[PDB]
């Protein structure tokens, strides 16, 4: 009742990924709905008292894109490409032998990476208080790019400004040496110039040094982290607004939740140690946008006079304000594809937190013994026009010898992914 | 008369450079021709011995490959593409402001690499005993490409042959132990094994490498070198038949004439040091192609009898047999496009030694104050299908923080190409 | 903050443990899977909308909480509250 | 993979050197890279390590303030200052190289087992 | 900081033997990973097992060791003339620290 479709079609602008895979779908609940709740659990904290029900219903999962893509096809994507977004979706279920939307919290239970492996279908669940085609709403492309310019430096270094600035408030040492002198804002001095653009907004971050005898002697994974408080329970953020990692330069600090982090195969499920876990840093976009674990700035907090000096606060969260400009969160191999925005009568920026399309009308859940499942996606492609001369940065497989050859099975049959892929780059201007 | 056009359109399987430079025509012998000889700047040596003349004229080049592509544009060729070679060409001199075959030798004077420099045009000469377009005449793609699979190993590893080899000459210890015995050839035993090919010919080479203290300490540039010799003279071997330049995992070894030699920007003529040079390697074709610093294989010497051993003695040349295989040398950006065949009676195989497209009728020459050169070449592409499954390596820039950029101007306007980079990369099967 | 599926674990991990107490040089980093045991520690891709304190969040208390310092080996971890917060992307909100 | 060590040389006590650990036969940018020592009288002793960037370097207490590494990436090679040297810096000084691999995309977690060494160069200070 | 100590000092072979030999460390916070190499004189050390249970690249099945916590081991059998050396404990869980070795 089917065949065998796996491969990747690249025609012009578009891309035709084809991914087939196999299926077990046990009884669940046995074939009850099921409540469930924190008490069933034992609802040991305030923050994680929840209810809801549980169904008897398996799901289709395909939202992470290793599914979609082989890490060839991912390397031709990123590589060659400024920009990309789904178009048209194909489903088919064959083979067969015997509401809400729970697809955008990064669940399991997804298609396997390798089309060798099968899998387990999920159990659907909810909380409260055979084919089909699709066709994907109109999104932007998501860009794949790194900014080669930053937001602060795009002047003309050899010119100087018609505009002047404040440059000594006094002569020199003594009594009543005030003064006002205005110097002319020049390459020489390039902090003080006016600006059109500003950076994106902040919501700060604890950093954590991946060298441990630096950090505090003390548990401050929950005490000391970012978090959001709605109906009088504190949620954690995470991973938060998109923010740059570190700053250029510093690779041992990561911001505490402002990071997705990936296990790598086999890893457990609790307590494992850094080397398990591969966290993903969005360096990239320092350029435009604030460091997750600095400061934005700085405002004056009151008056100046005679007996007072001026006097100045940090400003730890910063909201949006008129001349921002900022990037999304970088989408990974093993990141999400799209998720649901919530109905709601407004929002800003849509695109969600963990990256991705944001999407009003996402691909629906199918909602459903052992069979075939053929799903194929329709991607459109952005190429770049790029003049820069010199060549760009690639993302390459390392040419040295090693046990294992990457993305690929060991001498056990377990497919791995070695590292997090980012989407970023190639280059732009800003 | 004339515009500058200087950017290269990617169109689907073809690629268009148009490449566009300022010169300088003086005159050349003040407008005599004058015969040229060894005997009038002594000759010490018949393998130097020429004579020619020296003509007025001028004549433009543009063979390199860097004068029609920019360090990106050839990014963007080689880990794109399993193949190119030209179609059509456009030149056109304009803006003006007051035969034997030279262009196939590797010779200085060409188009700038770097659009903003303004190159001299170099006097014609040769030896012995406005616009136009252009057509190519039909050769066979450059392969850019490194197989993924060696000569030796194209077996299936699971199964046995249906061959027998001859294991055993005798049953072990003592006088008369004389027998015959035969195996299945097989996976355990991968090297006894019948094949239908086997790799290309070999020349051999002299192995110098880059630690000096590893060299013998005594002169043996020339004295140690291969060589053909036509007529009394003598001509090193250069760059020879195409051979892996060095075994697996020796990277210091390269073979004495066997290699293409470039220099950094800023080497002076004669006696450089080694870190002033750019050596390239053909360790990309290691895999069907014999490594040049040794011996193609053995051979019997002798006939076996009852008193007489089995003898054996190594090729260090072998010739052409039926059923060999081999790749030609790799093309680089600051290496040779095209050349001349020679016209024979026969010949075997004219790809040029020294890499690139063998031609009878190659692009003419251009016999010709200051002015503009605008030259354009169609290239046609042969795209990637391949269907493996992790990803490639990719030629890419560094990460990391530097003084300068790398094909790119210094401080002082410098532009310099900081490494030789060929056109292999991607993989095939064998 | 509910949208989750409750059954499913998610392949995403966070910061549980950063020393293992009890002692003088204690100090790690473990990290476990974000999943139903733990709701209050996993990625979301939404934040409530803005706030400004009166005497969607709730208008009498702190949007929540930022930190304020960095942190070292002589450093605690600090915190502020934060009493009014402006437009993110991201944030939903309900008007009135 | 080649390390290669220049600059040891007697030095007098109060008198510093360079080392350099010029590398190849890996990408070389990718790997952390470190410095450990041996004194003839003793066995190996850790010094110093530097991340594949350059963004981290933590030293002994033994070493510190005397020592200084750095490592430039475009020339491939790695450079251990010795500044003010004591009696008791006396050893072959040995390159070593880090296993794990270094993007933009990642961080740097940490020192590891050594890899692979290089023929260490010998430093007396004695007068 | 972490304070290692070799439990045996020392023991000559004659080919053929085997016998085993560990390492304690002071507070001993992250047992995951820890390092043993064998050196030969006048000549660059080589590495011998990476992290707590894994052999290395190109070192014999007989070469193994075992550990958590503060004690550790290097167990390894069929005991060779090339194996009569010293052998080093790192724990690198923190910055790297040696043992001051144990030559057999």
């Known amino acids: 009742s089917g065949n065998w479709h796996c491969d990747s079609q690249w025609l012009g602008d578009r891309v035709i990924t084809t991914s087939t895979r196999t299926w077990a779908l046990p009884t669940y609940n046995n074939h009850l709905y099921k409540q469930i709740s924190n008490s069933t659990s034992g609802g040991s904290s305030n923050d994680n008292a929840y209810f809801g029900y549980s169904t008897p219903w398996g799901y289709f999962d395909f939202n992470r894109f290793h599914c979609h893509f082989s890490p060839r096809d991912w390397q031709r994507l990123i590589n060659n490409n400024w920009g990309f977004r789904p178009k048209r979706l194909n489903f088919k279920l064959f083979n067969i032998q015997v509401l809400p939307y729970v697809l955008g919290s990064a669940h399991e239970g997804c298609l396997p990476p390798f089309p060798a492996d099968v899998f387990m279908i999920p159990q659907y669940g909810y909380l409260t208080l055979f084919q089909f085609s699709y066709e994907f709403e109109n999104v932007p492309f998501h860009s794949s790019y790194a900014h080669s310019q930053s937001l602060d430096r795009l002047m003309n270094p050899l010119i100087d400004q018609y505009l002047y600035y404040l440059s000594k408030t006094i002569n020199g040492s003594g009594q009543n040496q005030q003064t006002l002198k205005f110097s002319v804002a020049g390459p020489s001095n390039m902090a003080v110039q006016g600006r059109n653009y500003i950076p994106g907004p902040s919501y700060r971050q604890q950093r954590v040094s991946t060298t441990v005898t630096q950090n505090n002697n003390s548990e401050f994974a929950w005490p000391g982290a970012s978090s959001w408080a709605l109906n009088g329970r504190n949620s954690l953020m995470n991973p938060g607004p998109a923010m740059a990692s570190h700053k250029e330069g510093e690779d041992r600090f990561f911001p505490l939740s402002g990071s997705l982090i990936f296990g790598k195969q086999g890893t457990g499920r609790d307590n494992v140690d850094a080397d398990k876990v591969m966290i993903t840093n969005e360096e990239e976009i320092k350029t435009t946008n604030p460091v997750a674990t600095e400061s934005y700035g700085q405002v004056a907090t009151n008056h100046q006079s005679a007996q007072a000096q001026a006097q100045t606060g940090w400003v730890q969260n910063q909201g949006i304000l008129p001349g921002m400009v900022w990037q999304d969160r970088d989408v990974y191999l093993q990141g999400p594809i799209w998720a649901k925005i919530p109905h709601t009568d407004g929002n800003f920026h849509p695109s969600p937190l963990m990256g991705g399309f944001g999407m009003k009308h996402p691909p629906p859940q199918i909602l459903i013994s052992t069979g075939q499942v053929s799903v194929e996606i329709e991607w459109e492609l952005q190429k770049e026009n790029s003049k820069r001369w010199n060549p760009e940065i690639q993302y390459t497989s390392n040419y040295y010898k090693s046990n294992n050859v990457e993305f690929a099975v060991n001498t056990e049959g377990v497919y791995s992914e070695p590292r997090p892929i980012g989407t970023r780059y190639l280059t732009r201007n800003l | 008369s004339g515009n500058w056009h200087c950017d290269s359109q990617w169109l689907g399987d073809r690629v268009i450079t148009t490449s566009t430079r300022t010169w300088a025509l003086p005159t050349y012998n003040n407008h005599l021709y004058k015969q040229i000889s060894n005997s009038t700047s002594g000759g010490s040596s018949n393998d130097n011995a020429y004579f020619g003349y020296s003509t007025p004229w001028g004549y433009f080049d543009f063979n390199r490959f860097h004068c029609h592509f920019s360090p990106r544009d050839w990014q963007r060729l080689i880990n794109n593409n399993w193949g190119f070679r030209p179609k059509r060409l456009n030149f056109k001199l304009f803006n003006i402001q007051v035969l034997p075959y030279v262009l196939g030798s590797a010779h200085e004077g060409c188009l700038p690499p770097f659009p903003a420099d303004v190159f001299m045009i170099p006097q014609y000469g040769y030896l012995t005993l406005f616009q136009f377009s252009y057509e190519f005449e039909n050769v066979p793609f450059h392969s850019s490409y490194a197989h993924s699979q060696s000569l030796d190993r194209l077996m299936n590893p699971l199964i046995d042959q249906y061959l027998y080899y001859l294991s055993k000459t005798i049953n072990g210890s003592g006088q008369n132990q004389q027998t015959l015995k035969f195996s299945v050839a097989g996976p355990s035993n991968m090297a006894v094994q019948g094949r239908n090919y086997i790799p290309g010919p070999s020349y051999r080479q002299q192995r110098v490498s880059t630690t000096v203290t590893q060299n013998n300490n005594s002169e043996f540039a020339w004295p140690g070198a291969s060589s053909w010799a036509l007529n009394g003279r003598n001509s090193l071997m250069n760059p020879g038949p195409a051979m892996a330049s060095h075994k697996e995992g020796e990277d210091r070894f390269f073979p004495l004439s066997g290699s293409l030699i470039f220099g950094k920007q800023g080497t002076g003529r004669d006696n450089v040091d080694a870190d002033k040079v750019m050596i390239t390697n053909e360790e990309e074709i290691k895999t069907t192609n014999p490594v040049a610093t040794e011996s193609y294989g053995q051979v019997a010497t002798n006939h076996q009898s009852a008193q007489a051993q089995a003898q054996t003695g190594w090729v260090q040349n072998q010739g052409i047999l039926p059923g060999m295989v081999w790749q030609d040398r790799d093309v680089y950006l600051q290496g040779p496009i095209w050349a001349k065949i020679p016209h024979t009676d026969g010949n075997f195989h004219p790809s040029p030694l020294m890499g690139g497209f063998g031609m009878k009728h190659p692009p003419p020459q251009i016999l010709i104050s200051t002015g503009q050169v605008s030259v354009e070449i169609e290239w046609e592409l042969q795209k990637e299908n391949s269907k493996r499954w992790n990803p490639e390596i990719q030629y890419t820039s560094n990460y990391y923080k530097s003084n300068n950029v790398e094909f790119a101007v210094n401080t002082e306007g410098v532009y310099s190409e900081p490494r030789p980079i060929g056109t292999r990369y991607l993989t095939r099967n064998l | 903050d509910r949208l989750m599926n409750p059954l499913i674990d998610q392949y995403l991990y966070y910061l549980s443990k950063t020393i293992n107490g009890s002692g003088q040089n204690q100090q790690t980093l473990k990290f476990s899977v974000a999943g139903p045991s733990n709701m209050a520690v996993q990625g979301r891709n939404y934040i409530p909308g803005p706030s400004y304190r009166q005497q969607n969040p709730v208008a009498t208390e702190s949007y929540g909480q930022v930190a304020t310092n960095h942190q070292s080996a002589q450093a605690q971890a600090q915190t502020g509250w934060v009493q009014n917060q402006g437009i993110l992307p991201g944030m939903v909100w309900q008007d009135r | 993979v080649q390390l290669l060590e220049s600059g040891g040389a007697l030095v007098q006590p109060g008198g510093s050197l360079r080392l350099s650990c010029a590398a190849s036969?890996?990408?070389?940018?990718?790997?952390?890279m470190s410095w450990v020592r041996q004194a003839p009288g003793k066995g190996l002793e850790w010094v110093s390590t530097?991340?594949?960037?350059?963004?981290?370097?933590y030293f002994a207490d033994s070493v510190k303030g005397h020592f200084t590494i750095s490592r430039d990436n475009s020339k491939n090679t790695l450079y251990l200052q010795m500044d003010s040297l004591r009696a008791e810096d006396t050893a072959v000084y040995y390159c070593?190289?880090?296993?794990?691999?270094?993007?933009?995309?990642?961080?740097?977690?940490?020192?590891?087992?050594?890899?692979?060494w290089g023929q260490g160069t010998l430093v007396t200070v004695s007068s | 900081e972490i304070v290692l100590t070799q439990s045996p000092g020392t023991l000559s072979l004659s080919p053929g033997e085997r016998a085993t030999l560990s390492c304690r460390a002071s507070?001993?916070?992250?047992?995951?990973?820890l390092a043993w190499y064998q050196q030969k004189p006048g000549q660059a050390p080589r590495l011998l097992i990476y992290?707590?249970?894994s052999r290395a690249t190109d070192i014999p099945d007989r070469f193994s060791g075992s550990g958590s916590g503060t004690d550790f081991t290097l167990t390894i059998s069929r005991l060779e003339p090339e194996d009569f050396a010293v052998y080093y404990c790192?724990?690198?869980?923190?910055?790297?620290?040696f043992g001051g070795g144990t030559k057999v």
């Open positions: 070593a190289k880090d296993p794990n691999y270094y993007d933009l995309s990642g961080y740097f977690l940490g020192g590891y087992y050594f890899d692979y």
């Open positions: 036969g890996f990408s070389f940018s990718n790997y952390a």
């Open positions: 530097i991340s594949a960037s350059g963004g981290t370097t």
């Open positions: 507070q001993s916070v992250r047992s995951s990973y």
């Open positions: 992290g707590a249970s």
């Open positions: 790192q724990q690198y869980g923190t910055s790297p620290a």
